[PDB]
Amino acid sequence: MKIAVIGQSLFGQEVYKELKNEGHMIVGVFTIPDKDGKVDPLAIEAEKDGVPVFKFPRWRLKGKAITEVVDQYKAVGAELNVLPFCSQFIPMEVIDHPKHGSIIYHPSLLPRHRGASAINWTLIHGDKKGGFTVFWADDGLDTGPILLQRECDVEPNDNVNSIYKRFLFPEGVKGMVEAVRLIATGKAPRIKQPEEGATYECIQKKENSKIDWNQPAEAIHNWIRGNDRVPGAWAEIDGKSVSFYGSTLLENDHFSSNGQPLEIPGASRAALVTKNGLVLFGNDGKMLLVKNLQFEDGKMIPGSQYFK
Numbered sequence: 001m002k003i004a005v006i007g008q009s010l011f012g013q014e015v016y017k018e019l020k021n022e023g024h025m026i027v028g029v030f031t032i033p034d035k036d037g038k039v040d041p042l043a044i045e046a047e048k049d050g051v052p053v054f055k056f057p058r059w060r061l062k063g064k065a066i067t068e069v070v071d072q073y074k075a076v077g078a079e080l081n082v083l084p085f086c087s088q089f090i091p092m093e094v095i096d097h098p099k100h101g102s103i104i105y106h107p108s109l110l111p112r113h114r115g116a117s118a119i120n121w122t123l124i125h126g127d128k129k130g131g132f133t134v135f136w137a138d139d140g141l142d143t144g145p146i147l148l149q150r151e152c153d154v155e156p157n158d159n160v161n162s163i164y165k166r167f168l169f170p171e172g173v174k175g176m177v178e179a180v181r182l183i184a185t186g187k188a189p190r191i192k193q194p195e196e197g198a199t200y201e202c203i204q205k206k207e208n209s210k211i212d213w214n215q216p217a218e219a220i221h222n223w224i225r226g227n228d229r230v231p232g233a234w235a236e237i238d239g240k241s242v243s244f245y246g247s248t249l250l251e252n253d254h255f256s257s258n259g260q261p262l263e264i265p266g267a268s269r270a271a272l273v274t275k276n277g278l279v280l281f282g283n284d285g286k287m288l289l290v291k292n293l294q295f296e297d298g299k300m301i302p303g304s305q306y307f308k
Ligand SMILES: Nc1nc(O)c2cc(CN(C=O)c3ccc(C(=O)N[C@@H](CCC(=O)O)C(=O)O)cc3)ccc2n1
Pocket: 059, 060, 083, 086, 087, 088, 089, 090, 091, 092, 095, 104, 106, 114, 115, 116, 117, 137, 138, 139, 140, 141, 142, 143, 144, 203
């Protein structure tokens, strides 16, 4: 069938590639404009195939959909919109335009974790189970009826990147492909989302990923891994804004074997720089270990080397 792909990043590219190699006509790709001279991977792949690439900076403006944008989209004649990882909220005149409407990839077990930072919050809350959902877009935020859903285990030391690469990405690509296949054969369902279990969380940017030190070690661990690597949980250390990556809960050891005292404003007590990384304390006195630190200037250094 004729598909419009509205998304970005490598996930958008992979969904694009699998759909076209299943024989669907990609009549248009609608991704983000290039910034810093870099073309989005989805735009790159599509232009090689002679598929029309669009790079709208915005779809809606002052409450309403932009007219020029909507008519450019409508011209490609999509029978279905596929939104692999669309970072932009889409006007209903676009969503409802195709024969089959629009389906959306979302990396949480809806109704839980509605919102664009669902993966982050899956970890921040320390969910034991995560996964993704392919749903039919409606006017609400991640509220549309479910087409399919897939579940995975959350590992105690999973960060965003690791659960994304192990499961959410590869199985998500196959889920998007299977969903389109169900639509084509005309047997895809519309499972209305249950009210019970529905949650919303804010979008995770750098400013609101600042660390609250006044929590148990486990909650700090979940927070840090839940923002690793983007946007990157951070805290003030000696006047500078320092980002934390690669957290693991740590019961061992005393002390663990000495190490160097590092004062952190707001921390329940002083941290310890050790040979294996930065040991941090929660308010319950328990410990976590952070492998990597990053200052505002982007260079990553091992926590063991803070003083060196
Ligand atoms: N009609 C419709 N309905 C949905 O549920 C959508 C979900 C998504 C995916 N998403 C979260 O799962 C999602 C992604 C980004 C955003 C978002 O708000 N992005 C911009 C705003 C873009 C805008 O306002 O147009 C931002 O706040 O940074 C919202 C939801 C994308 C488009 C959607 N369009």
